[PDB]
Design a protein around this ligand. Sequence first.
Ligand SMILES: OC[C@H]1O[C@H](O[C@H]2[C@H](O)[C@@H](O)[C@@H](O)O[C@@H]2CO)[C@H](O)[C@@H](O)[C@@H]1O
Length: 461
Amino acid sequence: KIEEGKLVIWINGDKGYNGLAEVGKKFEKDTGIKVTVEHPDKLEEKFPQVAATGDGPDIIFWAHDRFGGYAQSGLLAEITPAAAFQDKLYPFTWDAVRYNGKLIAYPIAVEALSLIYNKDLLPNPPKTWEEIPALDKELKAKGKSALMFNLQEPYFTWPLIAADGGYAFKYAAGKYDIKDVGVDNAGAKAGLTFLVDLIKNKHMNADTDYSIAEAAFNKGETAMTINGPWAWSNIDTSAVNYGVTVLPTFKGQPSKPFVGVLSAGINAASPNKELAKEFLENYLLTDEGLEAVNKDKPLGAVALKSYEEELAKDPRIAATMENAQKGEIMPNIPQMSAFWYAVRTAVINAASGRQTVDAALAAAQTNAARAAAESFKEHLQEAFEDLGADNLRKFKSKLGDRRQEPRVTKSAIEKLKDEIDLADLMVGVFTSKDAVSVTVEILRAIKCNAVADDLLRNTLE
Ligand SMILES: OC[C@H]1O[C@H](O[C@H]2[C@H](O)[C@@H](O)[C@@H](O)O[C@@H]2CO)[C@H](O)[C@@H](O)[C@@H]1O
């Protein structure tokens, strides 16, 4: 499925992929070899499904937190450059791509979130989170609002949850301890309570996503947003006059974002391994290669010393590195994808009012330690689709009548939209193993025995 004598590359659709295609045209004009760039949907989950049997791209781009799990499954080739090349990039960027003693990818650039504001609507931005409710009121009298950002992905809400004390896994004596999880302490509860109260008092809406918020800022309808360096380009095209600065404090403490390093790995089953090393070391990681990508969509603070010393004179970049020093570098261990699925479910149920804050975070502490939890959620979704709409109305009636603990209110059931919402409510209230046991019990009481049997052989077994 992988053809000898050319190169195929995969990268996310919010980065500068037309700029990267210009670098491959130059490689073709010096050697004749053709390069193709693609941007599929959900690529961080498609890559481990196709590469296990030897298919996929020659080269894959993503942040460093996903790569430890790919290496444990045997999907990547080892990286081995000469000491003369290694001295061209900062030593702290090589530390982020080192796993069990070996290097497993090439580092490209450093990314962190900041606060972006409209100078004509608000020439002096606020220094604390506590000030935002009163400022929303002044702006409505002009037909506007104060702040809008993406509420569906937990990367954007984590800086406030961590300000007064929350954490992922505890670091002690040279290693992360995978059975000491920090999403349910006193500091984590206070930050999530402040976010839900903004929604209750009608300063924000619970269905806001990435493209809704991007259009409102660029049209002048809102005063502030929260985003990374890749977004600066489309703002330049618009009519808005903008600045970039440090995030606000909470209870007197700084906000603390998680920082990522964009990186490039090589497929263990590729037959083009030495063509791939020549493209990356001699064409992309140079002054003129990185300049072509940066002009399409900006990269942040790059890994190559000779070019980063010039970019550091830009005041937008100085603010990016101040937020990075108040935050923390992400771990790369294989347990990180189970952590991100658990926190995503907790924020969605609490912002929509289907669960209380305290009950949602106590279940996340348990789900974050279970490797197979997200797989169980996908098998529940498929069983609800197979019942059909008439039989699924009977299922939801019996769930609302249960007297066993924990109980589910009838108002919360009427607010669901489809089969994906129902599977997320079940794993968030009961945790993942108990969710399957209760579902099988209700299916037997409405006489749907074939569906219950198929679900059992693919989970608890
Ligand atoms: O929301 C969970 C998600 O966060 C990070 O993904 C970022 C990525 O690093 C950025 O480059 C940008 O594309 O936005 C993404 C969030 O929408 C983690 O790297 C990722 O593993 C995680 O699932």
